[PDB]
Amino acid sequence: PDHELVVCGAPDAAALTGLLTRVRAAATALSRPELTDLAAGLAAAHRGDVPARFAAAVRDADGLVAALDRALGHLAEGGRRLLDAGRGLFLVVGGPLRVGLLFPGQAAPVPVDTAVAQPAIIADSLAGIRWLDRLGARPVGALGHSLGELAALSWAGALDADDTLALARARGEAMSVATEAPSGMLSLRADLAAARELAAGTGAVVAVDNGERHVVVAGTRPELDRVAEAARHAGIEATPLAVSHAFHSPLMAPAAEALRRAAGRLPWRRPERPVASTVTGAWWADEDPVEVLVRQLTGPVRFREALGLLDADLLVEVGPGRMLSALAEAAGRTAVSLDAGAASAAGMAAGTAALFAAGAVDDATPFFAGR
């Protein structure tokens, strides 16, 4: 892999300083294969009940030396918690921390035909769920952004993987049908009230409530033009999205009959793990999944509210890309993506590091098996 995962732990902070100092000494000027042996040996030895934990995703021995210097400096100053998702470095003494999952929707790495994109994305997320299963991960709950809600529900045990992937095909097929007229989406760097003001009387509606400075509206081309005028006049930055459909708007209502049919046939079960819905903006509490999934097509994505509900020190995005991690960071949250299905192991290393350091997984050895 292009990034190595290096974990270790100790019974307390003092012991962890001792160990990290030995590892830093052993790390200097190691070649790439010797770094791998070092990392594999540490993963084998530091698993189970590991009270104080260090994990880093590194490109090479000098990247490990750098991460160890940072961890040592944090400990040396009485620090007990350093989570730097952007540098793949996690240190936690006195965990476990609460960890939540984020399942991405489309616009995620596979404009692409939504009929192809949807089940490709869901397949990557379900493979990410297999990875979390392999590690025995214990997240406190999950949120899925649009299509991602299907993956969150599958993780929560409301639907098996085969049925979930079958539903994502049918969904992508239903939704790729052309709207009655040219339509699209427009992203505004502004909060919900500002978007509703700019959209008021235009025909355009809120499609995606991502955060205090990202709200997307959707409508026909004339409708979006009127918002674009209004945004320029108000000095709000408005960015056209390269999509061919006004997703999350009433223009998607014809897709309902088809999606209702596909979803009504499935063996739905009560979710057994917490799911913060971006359809209701609330915890899932015995909803009828068919009605929720149909209204998801025309209603807005309540990502800002759902994320707000998920109380977690660390979020791990379980799916292709790192879009939801970028949104969570935009809300001041700590988030790292597994980037499930990416060519590069960057995300698999950083997200598994984060899981191990947070105490959500006890054993990193599965990162070193069968290369």
3-state secondary structure (DSSP) of residue 245: coil
Residue 292 in tokens? 């929720």
Residue 248 a catalytic site member: yes
Give CA 30 to chain center in angstroms: 34
Asked whether the beta carbons of 20 and 8 are under 8 A apart, the reply is yes
Residue 3 a catalytic site member: no
Cis peptide before 96 (omega within 30 of 0): yes
Q: Which listed residue (248, 277, 325, 337) is catalytic? A: 248
Sheet strands (E) in the chain: 4-10, 52-58, 81-84, 89-93, 99-103, 141-144, 183-188, 205-211, 214-220, 238-240, 275-277, 314-317, 335-337
Q: Which listed residue (125, 146, 249, 325) is catalytic? A: 146
CB atoms within 10 A of CB 86: 12
Backbone angles phi, psi at 63, to 5 degrees: -60, -35
- Burial environment of residue 181 by CB neighbours within 10 A (0 to 12, 13 to 18, 19 or more): exposed
Interruptions in the chain after residues (C–N over 2.5 Å):
110
| Strands laid side by side in the 141-144 sheet | 275-277, 141-144, 99-103, 314-317, 335-337
The catalytic site residues sit at 146, 248
